[PDB]
Write a protein that binds this ligand. Structure first.
Ligand code: HEC
Ligand SMILES: [Fe+3]
Length: 106
C-alpha cells in the first residue's frame, strides 16, 4: 500500500487498541500495525523525494519504523500474556514516536 494508506492503518488500529475489550483484540490490532509500519518503511516520503535514497535522512526515516516495530513487539508480549491494560498502555508509548517522525518528515 502507499504511505498514506499505511498511516491510516496505524492511526485506525491505535484507536482500536484504545477501545479494546481484551488482549487478543489488542494483539490483532498491533499485528496489523506491525505490517503497516514495515510497508510504510519501503516508501519515500514527499519531503525526502529530492534526497538520495542512501541519504542519512532516508535511513533515519526507515529506522523510525524499526523502532515503532520494536514497541509493537513489546506491547505484543503483554497482549499475548493476557495483560490488556498494560498492553494498551504500552501501545500509547508509540504516540511520541509517531509525533517525532511527523515533526521531521511529514
Ligand atoms: C516516520 C518514521 C513515521 C512514523 C514512525 C509515523 N508516521 Fe505517520 N506519517 C509519516 C509521514 C512522512 C507522513 C506524511 C505522508 C504524506 O504523504 O504526506 C505521515 C502521515 C500520517 C498521517 C496522515 C495521513 C494522511 O493521509 O494525511 C497519519 C494519520 C499518521 N501519519 C499516523 C501515524 C501514527 C498513528 C503513527 C504512530 C503509530 C505514525 N503515523 C508514525 C511518517 C511517520
Ligand atoms: Fe521508544
Amino acid at each position: 500500500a502507499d504511505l498514506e494508506d499505511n498511516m491510516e492503518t496505524l492511526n485506525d488500529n491505535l484507536k482500536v487498541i484504545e477501545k479494546a475489550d481484551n488482549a487478543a483484540q489488542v494483539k490483532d490490532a498491533l499485528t496489523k500495525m506491525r505490517a503497516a509500519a514495515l510497508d510504510a518503511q519501503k516508501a519515500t516520503p514527499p519531503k525526502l523525494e529530492d534526497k538520495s535514497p542512501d541519504s542519512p535522512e532516508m535511513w533515519d526515516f526507515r529506522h523510525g519504523f524499526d523502532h515503532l516495530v520494536y514497541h509493537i513487539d513489546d506491547a505484543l508480549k503483554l497482549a499475548n500474556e493476557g495483560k490488556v491494560k498494560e498492553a494498551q498502555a504500552a501501545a500509547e508509548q508509540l504516540k511520541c514516536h509517531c509525533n517525532a517522525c511527523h515533526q521531521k518528515y511529514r
